[PDB]
């Protein structure tokens, strides 16, 4: 349409827009506290982690790198950090 509000875009469009083509760029990634059943140590982890993040002393693999976002090991949950 001729009249489109470019200044205040629709939030659904902004979410379903490429990260670089938004009115202001914003990454689609996030940091998450992963909780693994067992040693119950919250571990900060990058969503698209490319290395194998390991427990500190718990010495277990928490995530597995992939082509996109890192795949959390089974039995581990995560919570987004603000």
């Amino acid at each position: 349409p001729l009249a489109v509000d470019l200044l205040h875009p629709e939030p659904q469009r902004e979410i379903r827009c490429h990260k670089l083509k938004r009115l202001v760029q914003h990454p689609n990634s996030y940091f998450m506290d992963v909780k693994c059943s067992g040693c119950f140590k919250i571990s900060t982890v990058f969503s698209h982690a490319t290395t194998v993040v390991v427990c500190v002393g718990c010495n277990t693999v928490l995530c597995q790198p992939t082509r996109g976002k890192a795949k959390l090991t089974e039995g581990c949950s995560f919570r987004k950090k603000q």
Partner: protein
Amino acid sequence: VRMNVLADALNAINNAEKRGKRQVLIRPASKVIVRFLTVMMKHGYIGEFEIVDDHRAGKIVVNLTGRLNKASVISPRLNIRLNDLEKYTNTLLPSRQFGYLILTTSAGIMDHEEARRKHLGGKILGFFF
């Protein structure tokens, strides 16, 4: 490789105006672009514009009043003296009654009318009408 942000911005404005859009987004902003748009605003060829900040060059969003026939850039920035200002205006502008020729002088960025009134030359930036 991008080498003239002003040229790209004026091309985007021209395309949006031809398509009849009410707003147009200009990619990387700059002081030169801001002053060009400000002169166009003072002369009434565009509506208000908003400079979107994104911790980089930024963007602009200009409201179009559907009153601009053409906005173009002259590259390279040739040096215009007061003596040939008349020839350049007669060559580039559609008529003597309207249309403005934007210069960049030491006093700043202005139109050829103000440049002549202040008796200033400088480097040509573009024109609109």
